Structure formats: C-alpha cells, structure tokens
Amino acid sequence: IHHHHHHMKVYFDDIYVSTARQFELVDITDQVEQIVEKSGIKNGICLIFVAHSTAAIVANEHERGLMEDILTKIKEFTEPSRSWKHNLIDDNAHAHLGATFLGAERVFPVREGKLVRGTWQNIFLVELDGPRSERHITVEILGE
Amino acid sequence: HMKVYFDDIYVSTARQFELVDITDQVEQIVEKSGIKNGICLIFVAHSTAAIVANEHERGLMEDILTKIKEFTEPSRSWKHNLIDDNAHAHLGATFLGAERVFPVREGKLVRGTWQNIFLVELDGPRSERHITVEILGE
Amino acid sequence: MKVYFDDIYVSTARQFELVDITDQVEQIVEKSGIKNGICLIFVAHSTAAIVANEHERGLMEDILTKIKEFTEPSRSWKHNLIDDNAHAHLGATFLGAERVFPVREGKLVRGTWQNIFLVELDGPRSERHITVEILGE
Ligand SMILES: [Cl-]
Ligand SMILES: [K+]
Ligand SMILES: [K+]
Numbered sequence: 001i002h003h004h005h006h007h008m009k010v011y012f013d014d015i016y017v018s019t020a021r022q023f024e025l026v027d028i029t030d031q032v033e034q035i036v037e038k039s040g041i042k043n044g045i046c047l048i049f050v051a052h053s054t055a056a057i058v059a060n061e062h063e064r065g066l067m068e069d070i071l072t073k074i075k076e077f078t079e080p081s082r083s084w085k086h087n088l089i090d091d092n093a094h095a096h097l098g099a100t101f102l103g104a105e106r107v108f109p110v111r112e113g114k115l116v117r118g119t120w121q122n123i124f125l126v127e128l129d130g131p132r133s134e135r136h137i138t139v140e141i142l143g144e
Numbered sequence: 145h146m147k148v149y150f151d152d153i154y155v156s157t158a159r160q161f162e163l164v165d166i167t168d169q170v171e172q173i174v175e176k177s178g179i180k181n182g183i184c185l186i187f188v189a190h191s192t193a194a195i196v197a198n199e200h201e202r203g204l205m206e207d208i209l210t211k212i213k214e215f216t217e218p219s220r221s222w223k224h225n226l227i228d229d230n231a232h233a234h235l236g237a238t239f240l241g242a243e244r245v246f247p248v249r250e251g252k253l254v255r256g257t258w259q260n261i262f263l264v265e266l267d268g269p270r271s272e273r274h275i276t277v278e279i280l281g282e
Numbered sequence: 283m284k285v286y287f288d289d290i291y292v293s294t295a296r297q298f299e300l301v302d303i304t305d306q307v308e309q310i311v312e313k314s315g316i317k318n319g320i321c322l323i324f325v326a327h328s329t330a331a332i333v334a335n336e337h338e339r340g341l342m343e344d345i346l347t348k349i350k351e352f353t354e355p356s357r358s359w360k361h362n363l364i365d366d367n368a369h370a371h372l373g374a375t376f377l378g379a380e381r382v383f384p385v386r387e388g389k390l391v392r393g394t395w396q397n398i399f400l401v402e403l404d405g406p407r408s409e410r411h412i413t414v415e416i417l418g419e
Pocket of ligand 2: 086090091092093096
C-alpha cells in the first residue's frame with residue numbers, strides 16, 4: 001500500500017535469554033538497538049517488555065560492580081529467605097515482589113532514527129528466579 | 145490515521161491497603177478498541193494509588209501489600225503527615241508508579257500466564273478510584 | 283499520526299533534589315497540537331529518574347529521605363570503587379527513567395495532586411536532559 005499521509009507503523013521483534021543464575025542482569029542494549037534500526041521507524045517509542053512475573057526490565061550503567069550492587073539491593077529488598085505466604089506454593093515469592101516493584105517494561109524515545117538514551121544507560125533483563133531456559137523479551141517500536 | 149481508544153474503569157476500595165484485579169476489564173477494552181497492533185496504557189490519576197502487574201495468588205497478594213507497608217511505613221512520622229496522614233501511600237505510589245504499558249499484538253493484550261493487572265490502593269477506603277485505559281495503535 | 287519532541291534542561295543544585303517540571307511538560311503537550319495520544323517524559327541519565335506525585339514540600343522531603351534510606355549513600359557498594367554514586371544508580375534503577383501519561387481531548391491527563399518531577403540523586407549537575415515526546419492524533 002502506497003500511503004500518502006503520515007501513519008502509525010508498529011514493528012515487533014523478540015529477544016530470548018537463557019539465564020544461568022538465580023539472580024542475574026543480562027545486557028540487551030545492542031539487541032534492542034539493532035531492532036530499532038531494523039524497524040525503519042525514525043520517530044516514535046520503543047517498548048521493551050517481559051511477559052514474565054519473576055523477571056523485570058531496567059535501565060542503568062553497565063559496570064560490573066554496579067550490576068552486583070543492583071542485584072544485592074534487590075535481594076535484600078525482596079528477602080529470598082523469608083516465609084512469604086506465596087512460598088507455601090512456590091519458592092519464589094521474592095522474585096515476584098522484585099518484579100512487581102521494578103516493572104515488566106521500560107519505554108524509550110526513538111528519535112531521528114536512534115534509541116534515545118544516555119551514554120551510561122543500558123537496558124537489562126533482570127532475572128530473579130533463574131536459571132530459566134527461555135526468558136522472552138518483546139521489543140515493540142511504534143511511530144513514523 | 146492511527147487509532148487511539150479510551151475507556152475508564154472506576155473502582156471503589158474497601159480497605160486501607162488493597163489489590164484490585166482489573167485484568168478482565170483491561171482485556172475487554174483492548175477487545176472493544178478494535179486495535180490489532182499497538183500498546184495498552186493503564187493509568188491512575190491518583191497520587192496514593194498505583195498500577196502493578198503480577199500473579200493473582202492470594203498469598204502473593206498479601207505478600208505484596210505487606211512488603212509495601214513495610215517499605216512505606218504507615219506508622220512513621222513522615223513530614224507530610226503534619227498535613228495529612230497518608231505519607232506512606234504517596235511514597236508507595238511514587239515508587240510503584242501510576243501506569244503500566246503492555247503490548248497489543250495480533251489483537252491480544254500481550255501478557256504472561258501469571259501476569260495480572262492490579263490497582264494498588266494504599267489509602268483506602270475510597271469511593272472512586274479512576275483508571276484510564278488507552279489503546280493506541282493500528 | 284503526529285510525533286512531537288521537545289527538551290527540558292535542568293541544572294540541579296543539591297546532591298538529592300526534586301525539580302517540578304509539570305508546567306513545562308504541559309506547555310509541550312499544548313504546543314504539540316496533539317489531542318489524543320500519549321506523553322513520554324524520559325531522562326537520558328542513569329543517576330536521575332522521573333516520578334509523579336504531590337507537590338507538597340513535606341512530602342518532597344519524605345520522598346528523598348526514603349530514597350536515601352533505600353539506596354544507602356554511605357554504603358561501600360562495589361561500584362563506588364569507580365565513582366561514589368552507586369546509591370544514585372540504585373535509586374534510578376528502581377524508580378525508572380520514564381513516565382507515560384495519557385493525553386486526552388487536548389489535555390495531559392493527571393490527578394489534582396499528580397505533579398511531574400525530575401529526581402536528582404547525584405547532583406549538582408549542570409545539565410540534566412529530559413526528552414518529552416507526544417505521540418498521537
Ligand atoms: Cl498528513
Ligand atoms: K511463583
Ligand atoms: K496526602
């Protein structure tokens with residue numbers, strides 16, 4: 001269809017991650033960026049979303065010490081060793097709590113063809129209940 | 145052209161701290177929008193409530209509220225409590241956020257099997273919590 | 283469809299600070315001409331965040347107090363070997379760099395007591411860059 005008016009483009013792609021540890025941060029920034037480039041959309045938004053209740057999406061600086069701090073703080077906050085009521089059923093209440101607070105998604109601007117983000121703003125999958133063989137991240141670009 | 149669709153969910157809350165599952169209502173609105181590919185924004189225009197997503201299991205729901213309470217400290221002499229007694233609710237809402245955004249893909253709200261959508265009430269009872277639901281897409 | 287961008291630049295004076303940017307965001311929504319859509323407010327920084335809550339000076343103090351307590355500026359975080367701001371990264375990681383508001387019938391949809399703040403956790407900084415994008419019809 002040869003459009004003649006500005007119109008909404010929506011482009012989807014998917015990133016899969018296998019996680020090795022119970023708590024893990026996995027940098028997905030370059031994969032998200034490649035999908036933004038692949039979309040051909042110049043101006044819009046990029047939604048990065050996990051359909052998982054024991055993982056999350058965050059954005060911060062890729063420095064190995066900090067990554068350890070992030071996971072240490074998440075662990076302290078969620079209390080994996082606590083007798084949460086959900087642990088009667090499962091053993092991952094802490095993971096659900098972390099994900100609930102952190103959120104399943106982050107939204108970035110896409111501008112003049114580029115993901116808008118800081119020099120030290122990388123995108124991470126936050127695993128709180130690994131190892132998992134398949135964490136699925138949806139990447140959606142929406143715009144012109 | 146593009147499509148933007150709005151609807152509204154109104155919820156009365158009974159307890160000071162409460163989780164209210166609105167998954168079905170959000171799904172209905174996605175369906176009624178007719179939008180096949182886009183996004184679904186679920187947003188509360190309230191500073192003492194929030195929108196979260198996680199598993200509808202009643203133990204976990206208790207856990208979430210317990211954690212929120214412990215984190216926000218309702219009994220603490222926060223400075224806002226000089227004006228009114230709900231500083232904790234503001235803090236929890238600040239941290240949790242007023243909105244969540246979900247993909248809409250091939251006509252369906254994209255969400256996990258154990259990912260339900262909740263209004264988080266931190267200062268109830270309230271007669272009217274207003275959730276805006278917006279679907280934007282093609 | 284229409285997509286409109288503008289920028290807010292904020293200089294911050296204190297290590298921890300909330301700066302209300304509500305009016306500026308509103309101005310940008312107005313200027314976009316967009317009637318129905320979304321408003322993204324995004325900070326391209328890892329030691330800052332965007333939140334929304336009530337502009338009451340006591341509560342503002344409480345928010346920052348809670349953030350400081352949660353993030354522990356005095357703790358020997360591993361990142362602090364490199365720069366003394368691990369607490370700021372932690373707060374930003376939890377709070378998030380973006381908020382998304384509806385725009386409806388030409389108005390930013392928000393509550394009476396829902397103001398939009400840049401959260402500075404590693405000030406003073408001469409330039410915090412906020413992108414505001416309005417997308418809609
Ligand atoms: Cl046109
Ligand atoms: K579980
Ligand atoms: K209040």
